[PDB]
Amino acid sequence: KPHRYKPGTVALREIRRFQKSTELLIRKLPF
DNA sequence: CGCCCTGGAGAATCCCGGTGCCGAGGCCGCTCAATTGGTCGTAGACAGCTCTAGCACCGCTTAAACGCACGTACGCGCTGTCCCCCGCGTTTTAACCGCCAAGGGGATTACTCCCTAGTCTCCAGGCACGTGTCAGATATATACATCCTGTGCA
Numbered sequence: 341k342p343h344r345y346k347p348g349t350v351a352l353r354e355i356r357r358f359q360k361s362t363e364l365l366i367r368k369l370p371f
Numbered sequence: 372c373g374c375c376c377t378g379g380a381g382a383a384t385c386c387c388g389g390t391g392c393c394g395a396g397g398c399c400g401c402t403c404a405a406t407t408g409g410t411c412g413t414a415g416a417c418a419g420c421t422c423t424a425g426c427a428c429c430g431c432t433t434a435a436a437c438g439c440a441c442g443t444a445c446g447c448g449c450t451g452t453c454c455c456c457c458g459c460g461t462t463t464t465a466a467c468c469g470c471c472a473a474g475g476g477g478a479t480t481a482c483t484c485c486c487t488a489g490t491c492t493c494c495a496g497g498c499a500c501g502t503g504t505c506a507g508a509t510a511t512a513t514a515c516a517t518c519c520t521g522t523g524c525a
Contacts, residue, residue, distance in 0.1 A: 343381070347457050353383085369466080 358365075 342459090344458065350458070367465090
Protein backbone atom coordinates (compact mmCIF):
# COMPACT_ATOMS: atom_id res chain seq x y z
CA LYS A 341 0.00 0.00 0.00
CA PRO A 342 1.57 3.27 -1.15
CA HIS A 343 1.81 6.15 1.33
CA ARG A 344 0.17 9.31 -0.02
CA TYR A 345 -0.94 12.44 1.81
CA LYS A 346 -4.39 13.90 1.30
CA PRO A 347 -4.56 17.06 -0.85
CA GLY A 348 -3.81 20.18 1.18
CA THR A 349 -1.43 18.65 3.74
CA VAL A 350 1.86 19.55 2.03
CA ALA A 351 0.76 23.18 1.59
CA LEU A 352 0.77 23.75 5.36
CA ARG A 353 4.24 22.29 5.93
CA GLU A 354 5.45 24.28 2.92
CA ILE A 355 4.09 27.44 4.57
CA ARG A 356 5.92 26.47 7.77
CA ARG A 357 9.11 25.77 5.82
CA PHE A 358 9.23 28.92 3.69
CA GLN A 359 7.92 31.31 6.36
CA LYS A 360 10.92 30.32 8.51
CA SER A 361 13.42 30.99 5.69
CA THR A 362 14.78 34.43 4.76
CA GLU A 363 16.49 33.18 1.59
CA LEU A 364 15.65 34.54 -1.84
CA LEU A 365 13.24 32.38 -3.84
CA ILE A 366 14.36 33.62 -7.29
CA ARG A 367 17.55 32.49 -9.01
CA LYS A 368 20.26 35.03 -9.80
CA LEU A 369 20.74 34.42 -13.53
CA PRO A 370 17.08 34.72 -14.69
CA PHE A 371 16.66 37.95 -12.72
C1' DC B 372 -26.08 -3.58 5.49
C1' DG B 373 -22.43 0.37 6.14
C1' DC B 374 -20.24 4.63 9.86
C1' DC B 375 -17.38 6.60 14.96
C1' DC B 376 -13.77 4.88 17.70
C1' DT B 377 -9.66 2.47 18.48
C1' DG B 378 -5.19 0.62 17.41
C1' DG B 379 -1.16 -0.29 14.53
C1' DA B 380 2.09 1.96 11.50
C1' DG B 381 5.03 5.47 9.48
C1' DA B 382 7.52 9.51 9.06
C1' DA B 383 8.31 14.41 10.13
C1' DT B 384 10.15 17.22 14.03
C1' DC B 385 12.81 18.67 18.23
C1' DC B 386 16.55 18.74 20.60
C1' DC B 387 21.24 17.65 21.95
C1' DG B 388 26.13 17.06 20.89
C1' DG B 389 30.43 17.35 17.52
C1' DT B 390 33.85 19.44 14.57
C1' DG B 391 35.41 22.51 10.81
C1' DC B 392 35.18 27.54 9.26
C1' DC B 393 35.35 32.71 8.92
C1' DG B 394 34.41 37.63 9.85
C1' DA B 395 33.67 40.81 14.62
C1' DG B 396 36.24 43.00 16.97
C1' DG B 397 40.49 44.42 18.75
C1' DC B 398 44.68 46.62 17.92
C1' DC B 399 47.55 49.94 15.66
C1' DG B 400 48.79 53.98 12.31
C1' DC B 401 47.29 57.82 11.31
C1' DT B 402 44.99 62.22 10.58
C1' DC B 403 41.31 65.86 10.19
C1' DA B 404 36.94 68.23 11.48
C1' DA B 405 35.45 69.24 16.39
C1' DT B 406 36.64 72.31 20.16
C1' DT B 407 37.94 76.92 22.24
C1' DG B 408 38.18 81.44 21.97
C1' DG B 409 37.45 86.14 19.85
C1' DT B 410 34.71 89.34 16.86
C1' DC B 411 30.49 91.18 14.87
C1' DG B 412 26.07 92.54 13.68
C1' DT B 413 21.48 90.91 13.81
C1' DA B 414 16.84 88.70 14.13
C1' DG B 415 13.68 87.32 18.17
C1' DA B 416 11.30 88.14 22.30
C1' DC B 417 8.88 92.26 24.98
C1' DA B 418 5.96 95.27 24.99
C1' DG B 419 2.71 98.56 22.45
C1' DC B 420 -1.15 99.58 20.46
C1' DT B 421 -5.21 98.56 17.63
C1' DC B 422 -8.89 96.57 15.50
C1' DT B 423 -11.83 93.17 14.01
C1' DA B 424 -14.00 88.94 13.36
C1' DG B 425 -15.43 85.16 16.84
C1' DC B 426 -18.64 84.63 20.80
C1' DA B 427 -22.84 84.15 23.05
C1' DC B 428 -27.66 85.17 22.11
C1' DC B 429 -32.80 85.94 20.65
C1' DG B 430 -36.51 84.90 17.75
C1' DC B 431 -39.22 83.71 13.13
C1' DT B 432 -39.32 79.96 9.59
C1' DT B 433 -39.51 76.32 7.52
C1' DA B 434 -37.49 71.33 6.90
C1' DA B 435 -35.20 67.23 7.62
C1' DA B 436 -35.69 63.23 11.48
C1' DC B 437 -38.29 60.12 13.34
C1' DG B 438 -41.78 56.50 14.50
C1' DC B 439 -44.14 53.17 12.38
C1' DA B 440 -46.72 50.07 9.19
C1' DC B 441 -46.42 47.25 5.37
C1' DG B 442 -43.63 44.01 2.37
C1' DT B 443 -41.12 41.43 -0.67
C1' DA B 444 -36.98 39.77 -2.10
C1' DC B 445 -32.31 38.87 -1.79
C1' DG B 446 -28.72 37.02 1.95
C1' DC B 447 -28.40 32.79 3.54
C1' DG B 448 -28.58 27.83 4.42
C1' DC B 449 -28.80 23.53 2.23
C1' DT B 450 -27.96 20.15 -1.48
C1' DG B 451 -26.09 17.77 -5.63
C1' DT B 452 -22.43 18.09 -9.25
C1' DC B 453 -18.19 17.81 -11.52
C1' DC B 454 -13.76 19.19 -12.57
C1' DC B 455 -9.11 21.02 -11.52
C1' DC B 456 -5.14 21.40 -9.23
C1' DC B 457 -2.20 18.78 -5.59
C1' DG B 458 0.65 14.69 -4.74
C1' DC B 459 4.01 11.76 -6.90
C1' DG B 460 6.84 9.41 -10.18
C1' DT B 461 9.49 9.83 -14.46
C1' DT B 462 12.01 13.15 -18.22
C1' DT B 463 14.57 16.96 -19.47
C1' DT B 464 17.54 21.25 -18.93
C1' DA B 465 20.62 25.13 -16.21
C1' DA B 466 24.48 25.72 -14.09
C1' DC B 467 28.89 24.62 -11.83
C1' DC B 468 33.59 23.27 -12.79
C1' DG B 469 38.27 21.97 -15.87
C1' DC B 470 41.06 23.57 -19.91
C1' DC B 471 43.65 27.35 -20.98
C1' DA B 472 44.85 32.57 -20.05
C1' DA B 473 44.84 37.33 -21.73
C1' DG B 474 43.31 42.32 -21.50
C1' DG B 475 39.82 46.83 -20.91
C1' DG B 476 37.30 50.89 -20.14
C1' DG B 477 35.21 53.54 -16.56
C1' DA B 478 34.84 55.48 -12.04
C1' DT B 479 38.69 57.34 -8.82
C1' DT B 480 42.13 60.49 -7.31
C1' DA B 481 44.79 64.37 -8.09
C1' DC B 482 45.84 68.52 -10.43
C1' DT B 483 44.64 72.66 -13.01
C1' DC B 484 42.59 76.98 -14.68
C1' DC B 485 38.45 80.56 -15.46
C1' DC B 486 34.43 82.75 -15.24
C1' DT B 487 29.06 83.02 -13.21
C1' DA B 488 27.26 84.63 -9.67
C1' DG B 489 26.98 86.35 -4.49
C1' DT B 490 27.21 90.85 -2.70
C1' DC B 491 26.71 95.51 -2.81
C1' DT B 492 24.58 99.41 -4.97
C1' DC B 493 20.90 102.68 -7.01
C1' DC B 494 17.10 103.62 -10.30
C1' DA B 495 12.67 102.70 -11.79
C1' DG B 496 7.81 100.73 -12.21
C1' DG B 497 3.72 97.70 -11.36
C1' DC B 498 0.46 95.23 -9.37
C1' DA B 499 -2.65 95.54 -4.80
C1' DC B 500 -5.93 98.93 -3.95
C1' DG B 501 -9.57 102.49 -4.57
C1' DT B 502 -13.17 104.00 -7.53
C1' DG B 503 -16.53 104.15 -12.22
C1' DT B 504 -19.73 101.91 -14.47
C1' DC B 505 -22.91 98.35 -16.47
C1' DA B 506 -25.34 93.44 -15.81
C1' DG B 507 -28.53 91.04 -13.47
C1' DA B 508 -31.95 90.62 -10.20
C1' DT B 509 -35.77 93.26 -7.66
C1' DA B 510 -39.98 95.68 -6.64
C1' DT B 511 -43.52 98.38 -8.22
C1' DA B 512 -47.25 101.69 -11.77
C1' DT B 513 -50.59 100.14 -15.27
C1' DA B 514 -53.83 99.30 -19.01
C1' DC B 515 -56.56 96.34 -19.67
C1' DA B 516 -59.33 92.08 -17.86
C1' DT B 517 -62.62 88.77 -15.45
C1' DC B 518 -66.74 88.40 -11.75
C1' DC B 519 -70.32 91.11 -9.42
C1' DT B 520 -74.02 94.25 -9.31
C1' DG B 521 -77.54 97.56 -10.22
C1' DT B 522 -80.69 97.84 -13.58
C1' DG B 523 -83.65 98.54 -17.12
C1' DC B 524 -86.28 95.81 -20.11
C1' DA B 525 -90.69 92.48 -23.40
